[PDB]
Amino acid sequence: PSLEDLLFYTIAEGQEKIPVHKFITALKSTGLRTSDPRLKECMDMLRLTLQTTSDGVMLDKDLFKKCVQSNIVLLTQAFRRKFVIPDFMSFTSHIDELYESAKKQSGGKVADYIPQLAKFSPDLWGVSVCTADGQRHSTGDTKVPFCLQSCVKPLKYAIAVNDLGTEYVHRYVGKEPSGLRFNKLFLNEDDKPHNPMVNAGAIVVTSLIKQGVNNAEKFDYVMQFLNKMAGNEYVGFSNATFQSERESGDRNFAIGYYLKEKKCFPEGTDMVGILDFYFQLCSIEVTCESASVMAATLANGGFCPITGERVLSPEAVRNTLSLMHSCGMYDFSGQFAFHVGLPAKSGVAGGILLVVPNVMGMMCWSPPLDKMGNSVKGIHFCHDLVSLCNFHNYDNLRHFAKKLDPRREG
Amino acid sequence: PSLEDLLFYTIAEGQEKIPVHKFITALKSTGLRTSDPRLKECMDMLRLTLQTTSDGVMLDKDLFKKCVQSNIVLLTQAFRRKFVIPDFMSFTSHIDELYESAKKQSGGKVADYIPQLAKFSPDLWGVSVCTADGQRHSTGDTKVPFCLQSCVKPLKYAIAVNDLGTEYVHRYVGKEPSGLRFNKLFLNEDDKPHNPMVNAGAIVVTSLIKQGVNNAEKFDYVMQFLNKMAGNEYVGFSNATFQSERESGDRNFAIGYYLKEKKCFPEGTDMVGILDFYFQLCSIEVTCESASVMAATLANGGFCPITGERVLSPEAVRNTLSLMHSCGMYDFSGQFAFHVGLPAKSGVAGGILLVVPNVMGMMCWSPPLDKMGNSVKGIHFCHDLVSLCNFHNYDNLRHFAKKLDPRRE
Amino acid sequence: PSLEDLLFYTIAEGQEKIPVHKFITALKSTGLRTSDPRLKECMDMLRLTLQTTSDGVMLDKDLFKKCVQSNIVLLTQAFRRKFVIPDFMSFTSHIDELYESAKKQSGGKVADYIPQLAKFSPDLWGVSVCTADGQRHSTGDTKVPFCLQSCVKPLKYAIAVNDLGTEYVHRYVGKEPSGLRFNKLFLNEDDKPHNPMVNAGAIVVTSLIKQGVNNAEKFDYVMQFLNKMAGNEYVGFSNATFQSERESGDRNFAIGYYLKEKKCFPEGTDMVGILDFYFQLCSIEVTCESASVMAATLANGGFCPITGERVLSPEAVRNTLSLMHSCGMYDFSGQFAFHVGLPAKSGVAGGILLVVPNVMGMMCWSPPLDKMGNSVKGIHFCHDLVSLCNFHNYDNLRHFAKKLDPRREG
Amino acid sequence: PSLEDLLFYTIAEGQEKIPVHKFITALKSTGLRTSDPRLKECMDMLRLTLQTTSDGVMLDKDLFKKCVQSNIVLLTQAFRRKFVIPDFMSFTSHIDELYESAKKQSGGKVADYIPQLAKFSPDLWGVSVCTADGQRHSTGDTKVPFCLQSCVKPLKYAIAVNDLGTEYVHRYVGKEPSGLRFNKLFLNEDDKPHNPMVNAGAIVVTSLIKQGVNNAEKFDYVMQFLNKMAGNEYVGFSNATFQSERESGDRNFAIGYYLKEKKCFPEGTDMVGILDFYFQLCSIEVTCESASVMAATLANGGFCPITGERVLSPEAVRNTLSLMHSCGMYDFSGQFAFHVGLPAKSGVAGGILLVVPNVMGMMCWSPPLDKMGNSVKGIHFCHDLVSLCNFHNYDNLRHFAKKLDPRREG
Ligand SMILES: O=C(Cc1ccccc1)Nc1ccc(OC2CCN(c3ccc(NC(=O)Cc4ccccc4)nn3)CC2)nn1
Ligand SMILES: O=C(Cc1ccccc1)Nc1ccc(OC2CCN(c3ccc(NC(=O)Cc4ccccc4)nn3)CC2)nn1
Structure with missing residues (x-):
């Protein structure tokens, strides 16, 4: 044979x-x-x-x-x-219909608080899929770069836990949602930010990564890490977004000074520099295609699916998925976890990094945000997606009513 | 052939x-x-x-x-x-080791507020497994009856969603955790209770089931339902627990009046009557064996695994699982979701109804509770279980480090 | 001579x-x-x-x-x-202007949550004065009975402190305002209601008065007490108001059960019976004339000005004046204390029991309530009064700008 | 004649x-x-x-x-x-007894968060009286300088209102106590700091005074103002406290940025400069003697009692007294208003600026602070004073039980 x-x-x-x-x-x-x-x-x-x-x-x-x-x-x-989606050509035509159906939700306001999120046209709309096996599909504006903004929050959290461990990272950051009551509070009862997905929590996580080197090497190391996460697809930097985020980050300086006073940083932290590093990390650029590979790495237990490389430890991916589930969509997190049931993370540029564990990673992008900060087309697509496929975290793989299951062929 | x-x-x-x-x-x-x-x-x-x-x-x-x-x-x-756990004999040897390691965790206090929970011995400890295919295993005191208490809340919620639908039910009750800052607040910003897993939400949910009949038929309507969920194994009733809950439920009577004033019940609700119905549903009894089949029905998309009967709609089971994930363990819920990552529900009798979606349901029971109301041994078992097997919601089925996968050969 | x-x-x-x-x-x-x-x-x-x-x-x-x-x-x-207001005839002419100018504030809604307050016409508006020396003046509908409702709370608080002392009473009730939007939190950090002026605090106070006798003798004791406070002017009871408060007090029953569970009552308290006593105390009736003497006793260190009797201990009157200053006007207490600077207490029937310490007591009554529960005309009058006279608690008796001082002569 | x-x-x-x-x-x-x-x-x-x-x-x-x-x-x-206290020599014998009675309360902790408050001895203790007529008495360490710290907050507020009016000032800062659940919050429901006596309110108030000139002229304008309040007795400045206060004010820098983002400052405010001005106003030094004349000016409707000068408008003095009544002693204000019933203001240096309206001003000073930030001996003296004399806001001037009234003879 x-x-x-x-x-x-x-x-x-x-x-x-x-x-x-x-x-x-x-x-x-x-x-x-x-x-x-x-x-x-x-x-x-x-x-x-x-x-x-x-x-x-x-x-x-x-x-x-x-x-x-x-x-x-x-x-x-x-x-x-033998790939996770056997009839992938069928599945992509379902992706295409979903994309066309959100493309008609032209509501929402593009973020304008810095002129760089304001340049972006409100009709830009892209969806990129990457499965745990490297099957790829895009539809819409999937090769135009945009900044990660808070979509970088789960990524640097994963890096921190990968390098330092769950116990060290969560000395400085909580691991729960704050409750639809304390979006305004910075700290919990142990005087830690509630989770890595809020600004106070993200800022502390930034202070934990590659301590002891300067901001240029810290940033170089994270760029390194997202390169392996994206299988070396497009990862960049918008210094225009960086310069505007810093001439407008008065809330972030408020958070930084509060955290400094509450001694929430590791010893020897130069807080104002961490804020500069933090502004850099949110001005990192991706496309829908390159970001979906980052999402696919999290869907694949820490292995980048188009290279095979082990990029994150399983503890780091589990924690990041666990906290994307509950705290990932700002004040919509509870409604999203209930109705969509997928680990996801929104950013103000209009991206929604979405993970279907054991199946695929995705990056949706449309700049118009809704009243809660999440992309209108992106949010619409994820409801449709879970309304069509038994991808909801607590759908059943055997009895799932009339929904479709792309993991099977018959 | x-x-x-x-x-x-x-x-x-x-x-x-x-x-x-x-x-x-x-x-x-x-x-x-x-x-x-x-x-x-x-x-x-x-x-x-x-x-x-x-x-x-x-x-x-x-x-x-x-x-x-x-x-x-x-x-x-x-x-x-070809069952979900091919090597069931090896797996039960793991369940037994897990049980014996939790059996040595002698901390916690048995509930005292009624003499029916206080008469239970602290050395009682049992775990019962039932798979989505009906493979069964027990260890410890798994044939001792005890009341579900708040373990009944996810079940009556599932019954409610099954009969009236997600949209109708959540006109009256939220779908999020309150934030462990508000055990004290009864209502959220839209003047609904935060979720069905807190006492206020369960009382509203209790008011939604079988509207228009008296409490005797409502109770039997719920009983028919729980019989089916457990494949007709033991489901019972403690009138002793019922009478003591009603002569000591000043807090639920407080909730009932508050909800009545804030108009949180459907029109025509007899509030104090709903409160009596609520105290009854919390006095319904199970064993670990019978309740683990109820848990396995929730793990099985709503089909009871030892009979094949469709008992709940998938919308009902999914909703109930999502809210056990986030609101099922009182103030331990966030920590439980993070570290254990399983749909579970705690009760004051010392039970923890636990669901591993697509694999099995479980009921662990040990009366001594910790500071937060969760059974000490039960919580210890659930951490051990997920540390051993890749059952965590966001574990990976392909790359799972040093963990064991009982779905594999 | x-x-x-x-x-x-x-x-x-x-x-x-x-x-x-x-x-x-x-x-x-x-x-x-x-x-x-x-x-x-x-x-x-x-x-x-x-x-x-x-x-x-x-x-x-x-x-x-x-x-x-x-x-x-x-x-x-x-x-x-030699009376506290020498030229009393001049002063009543200002009361008349203040009354007539408030009479044109036709805003507000009569409370209709029970048909007994809804029965009252918005037409009605009365003001009654009684000085620390027994000088009397009325204008408007001052001989029409109406219920005290929450205007009774400072009075039963005074009775409690008079009989048991500040220390015993405040084992069960706080002595501060809650913070203006904690109206439905029932307890403070020490599991006591915030103050006697809120429903939870009033309910605990009702349980403190005349412990050990039945509700009929408890009520007879408070009635006798309010008789001496008003110099034997009209004090009555509206059973109509009583039965509608009790077949509609779901919030008060919620409060009672909450207090029973948190063990906020003295040992041996019958909770539902106390709520009945409390509903009775809010159905006690007064007129403006009769109530202004009750206020005048409070302005006069506990001595009724038209009889000369010691009715309340000075410790009881001081505390009651202290908490009417900060907690007397619901969510208007902070604005009322700042701008008007007088101890006052409102009720849902449209009354405002008002005390000018060392000068006079008043009862303003107009049923139409404002968005916060306070009588529109009454609130308008209390501003005008303090805007005209140096009666504001922190006006100066020596240097007081454009204001008039009715205690002086020329 | x-x-x-x-x-x-x-x-x-x-x-x-x-x-x-x-x-x-x-x-x-x-x-x-x-x-x-x-x-x-x-x-x-x-x-x-x-x-x-x-x-x-x-x-x-x-x-x-x-x-x-x-x-x-x-x-x-x-x-x-004919002075407000006729037998002044008798009364000072009571002040001395009160002073010696608090001198035995040797508990409390001296503030150490900067080395300048830490070197003050814990049994420095002084009280200085100045009546509305300029009668003076001191006992203890009444001529040693210390900074006002938050004792400057009521004075700057009075200056702000004196120059700009109630309506303008309170466009930017509320007028109520926050509630002993909002001591941690910076803003109220209308996005203003709760009152002028908390740090966020003091910081906005500081941003309102003498806008359009630099910090040197602003500083001289306030000092010139506090000079008249003190009848030209010692008002000074500790640059040592100022330098250590600005290198430890991350909490106030946190407050500054938060207020900037929520736009709580007047247009064109240099926030970081305002913070410098704020750090200067708390490092201004007084003695018990000079500060007590400032207190006497507020007790005297805005006229400095030892010179005859009009220093503050009556609206300025009334407002400032109303807000020290309710918001002046940190989390102790409610208990203090209830039991002591006097306008007062606490500072971390151990000062309590105290005002008996229409009678006298006082400054008590003892560095050891109690758990809530209030000077242990100061607070003990203030309780003693009101238990001895009918100075409580809601004592009665005619019927005051066994208390003493220093305004009367015999
Ligand atoms: O341990 C804790 C908390 C805690 C919780 C539970 C148990 C015990 C301890 N620390 C902690 C956390 C956060 C916090 O807050 C700071 C201060 C400034 N900051 C504001 C500042 C004003 C506001 N203002 C409003 O909310 C206004 C408003 C009020 C009411 C209704 C509507 C609006 N918000 N955030 C956010 C950061 N302080 N301390
Ligand atoms: O000692 C404490 C706590 C404490 C002490 C020390 C240190 C930390 C903590 N006591 C305490 C008092 C009262 C209380 O509450 C009860 C129960 C429910 N009850 C509601 C219930 C929902 C509502 N509704 C809303 O909250 C809706 C809403 C939410 C947010 C913004 C706007 C609206 N109102 N009252 C009325 C009374 N709990 N505990």
Whole structure:
């Protein structure tokens, strides 16, 4: 027997030469992208076989074997429908309808409190999917960068817990929602911020990461970390957003000074610098595509699905998902957890980083916010998404009424 | 080919008659109990053959077909190791270790406010498991009756959502935790109680069930419902607990009048009557075994796992799970969601109704409570359980470090 | 010399027979009424000389002396302008302007939550004065009975402190305002109600009065007490108001059960019976005239000004004045204390029991209540009054700008 | 007749020359000090008579006329026992007893949060009286400087109202106590600090005074203002306290930024500069003697009692008294208003600026603070004072049980 030969016969279809475009089309049908880093040896070898000839361009079993040998494990599970979403082409047409249905919710106000969130057009709308297996799909404005803002809060929390542990991190930050009563209070009863997802909590978490080095290396290290989280897809920085966030962060300076007075920072913290680092971390830029890979890493137990690298420890991902569940959508967190039941995190730029554990990661983006700070189209999409699929954290995998389950084929 | 014959040969062992004590043993190893109602026809005929030919005791291949005939589907997935927990015998050895480690946590105080909770011994400790497929295991005092107390709140909420729908029910009760800053406040910003898991919310929920009949029919309507959730195992009533709760419920009488003044009940509500109904639902009794089937029904999308009956709509079960996750353990709820990450519900009798979605339901019971009202041993068990198995809501099924996965081989 | 004849010469005209109508008209100018209980022997004697032989309304120096003998001390300070308000006739003319200008504040809604207060016309508006010296003046509907409702709370608080002492009473009730929006929190940090002026505090206070006898004797004791406080003017009971307060007091029953569970009552308290006593105390009836004497006792250190009796201990009156200052006007207490600076207490029937310490007590009554529960006309009047006179608690008696001081002469 | 001649005979003692040492003793017994600025012409002339005529220290009627001529009015009310406290020598014996009674309360902790309050000895203890007529008495450490700290908050508020009016000032700051559940909150329901006596309210009030000039001119404008309140007695500045107060004020910097974000300052406010001004106003130094004249100015309707100057408008003084009544002693204000019933204001240095309206001003000073921030000895003295005299806001001036009234004779 031989696995490269088996794969060849199921794609060759009784024929005895496979055109290269027919293998690439079959490959995209799985949902993988030709630029998937795990396929680079096979793509490199197709580029090198495509130097021998403009004439022919077809692959027999040993030229097919010559190329796919290196990636045969990953290619066969794609072609034997063993990915988390077997009929991925069906699923993306459901993603497309959902996207078109939110695209009609043109309500909401674009954030204007700094001129950089204000440049953004209110009709921009993108959705990007990445599954725990690296199947990819985008629809809308998924390759235009925008700032993470508070979507960076779960990421730096994950980094902090990954490096220092749950017990150290939560000496300085709570792990509960504050209650739809104390959005205005900075501290709880043990004089810690309520959770890493609020501004007081995020600011303390920022003070914990890579202590003892300067802000340039702290920022470089986090940029490093989000690079592995996004499988090296687009991660950037908006100094324009950075400069406006700092000439307007009077609430954040208030929080910083309060926390300094309540001794909420580690010993030896230069608070005003932490606020500068914090403003930098919220001006980091992503696209829907690159952010959905960050989301997919959290959906995949800490392994980036398009590279296979272990990026976060399982304790760090669990905590971050646990706190995205309950504190992730500002004053909407309770309603979102009840009706949508997915770990999610909103930001004022209009992104909603969304995680379906064991299935997929996503980044929705539309700048118009609702009265609570969450993207109107984004919020609409997540209700529709869970209304269509048994993706709700407490849906049942066996008895789920008339909803659809993309993890299965029949 | 044929399914009874294959199953025969995989148990027949190359040999050509199967002793029934060996068939009964292979069966119990899967985790089913021979008294599973889904198995009653196969058991009834095994008893009839042990009568019709009392000479002999062994089963040839066509007498085997005569017995496993109508339950062959369930028997095959039991014997082909296809239940949610394939190696049930190993897993119960883990449950036993977990129980013995929680059994040495002797802290906590038994509830004193009525002499019925105080007469319970502090050495009582039991955990009962029931899977989404009906595999059962017990350890400790799992056949001792006790009242559900607030463990009844997620059930009556589920009954309410099942009968009237999410939107109607939550016209009268919120869907969030209050914030552990407001056990003291009864109402949220829209003058509804914060959620069904606090006393004020349960009292409003109690007022929604079976409107228009008297308390005797409402109670029996709830009783029919809880019988079905537990596959007809023990569901009872303590009038002793009921009478003491009503002569000491000055706080719930306080809540009732407040809700009446703030107009939180549906029109035409007899507030004091609802309060009497509420004290009754909190005096309903279960054992660990019978309640664990109720928990397993919630883990099973609303189908009772030992009968196959649809008891609750999936909307009802999902809502109830979401609110047990966040509001189920009084002031320990946030910590419980973070560290244990399981839908659970505490009661003052010392029970913790616990649900691992898609796997199993459980009921742990130990009367000594901690400072927050949660059973000391029960809480210790739930931390151990999640530290051992990847059952945490946001554990990963593919990458889970040093944890054990009982769903895997 | 002689004090009765000196008095005679001061009314005597330079002439030396005084007509009896001239003495009585000169008497009323003082602000005293001929039916003042301290004047009864002098009136009894005028009733008897007015028998003599009806010829000549005149009193010679020996017949005048025969009548004014027994009350000569009180009559001499009345006629030698030694009362707290010397020119009382001028002062009532300002009361009349203040009354007529408030009479045009037609805003507000009559309480209708029971049909007995809803029965009252918004037409009704009365003001009654009684000074620390027994000078009386009314304007408007001052002889119509209405219920005290929460205006009774300072009075039963005074009775409690008079009988048991400050220390015992305040084991069960706080002595501060709650903070203006804690009206439905029932207890403070020490699990006592915030003060006697809120429903929870009043309910605890009711449980403290005359412990150990039944509600009929408890009520008879408070009624006798309010009789001595009003110099035996009208005090009654509206059973109509009583039954509607009790078949509608769901908030008061909620409060009672809450207090029972938190063990806020003295040992051996029958909770639902106390609530019945409390509903009775709020159904006690007064008129403006009768109630202004009760207020005047409070302005007078606990001595009723029209009888001379010690009715309340000074400790009881001081505390009651202290808490009417801060807690007397519901959510208006802070604004009322700041701008008006007088101890006052409102009730839902439209009353405002008002005390000017060392000067006079008042009862304003107009049923239409404002958005906060206080009588519109009454509130308008209390501002005008303090805007006209240096009666504000922190006005200065020596340097007081544009304001008038009715205690001075020229 | 003639007023200089009358006064001579009541002192002339039956003789026809008054020894000057005897006139000075008769004067001091009234409670005036010979250096009273209102007495300067009489003292300058006695000193000059003591130079021109060494030949016998005796004063006849024509030379006694020569000295008391210019200050004749004030001298007569001093000697004809018309000052607010006629038997001033008796009363000071009561102040001394009260002082020695609190001197035995050696509990409490001296504030150490900056090294300047930490070096004050714990049994420094002084009380200084100044009446509405300028009668003075001190006992203990009454001439040692200390900073006002929050004792400056009522003075700046009075200056703000004096210059800008009630309506303007209270556009930016409330006028009620917060409630012993909102001591931690910075803002009320209308996004203003609760009252001028808490730090957020003091900080906004500081931002209102003398807008448009720099901090040097602002500072001199307030000092010049506090100089008149103290009859030009010692008002100074501790730069040491100022430098340590600005390097420890992260809580007030927290307050500043929060108020900036919630826009609680006038337009064009330099917040960080206002904070510097705020740190200066609390480092202003006084003694018990000089501060008690400031208190006496508020007790005297805005006139400094030892000079005759109008320093504050009556509206300014009334408001400031109303808000020290209810908001002046941190979390102790309600208990203090209830039991002591006097306008007072506490500071972390151990001062309590105390005002008995229409009678006298006081400053008590003892550095050891109790749990709530109030000077242990100061608070004990203030209870003692009101248990001894009927100065309580709602004591009665006519019926006051066994208490003493220093306004009366015997
Ligand atoms: O341990 C605790 C808390 C706690 C909770 C539970 C048990 C015990 C202890 N520390 C703690 C936390 C937060 C906090 O607050 C600070 C101060 C400023 N800051 C404001 C400041 C004004 C406001 N103002 C309003 O809410 C106005 C308003 C009031 C009422 C109705 C409507 C509006 N909000 N936040 C936010 C930070 N202080 N201390
Ligand atoms: O010693 C304490 C606490 C304490 C002490 C020391 C240190 C920390 C704590 N006592 C105490 C007193 C009263 C009290 O409350 C009771 C029960 C419910 N009860 C409601 C219930 C809901 C409402 N409604 C709302 O809150 C809605 C709302 C919420 C927010 C903003 C706007 C509206 N009102 N009253 C009336 C009375 N609990 N505990």
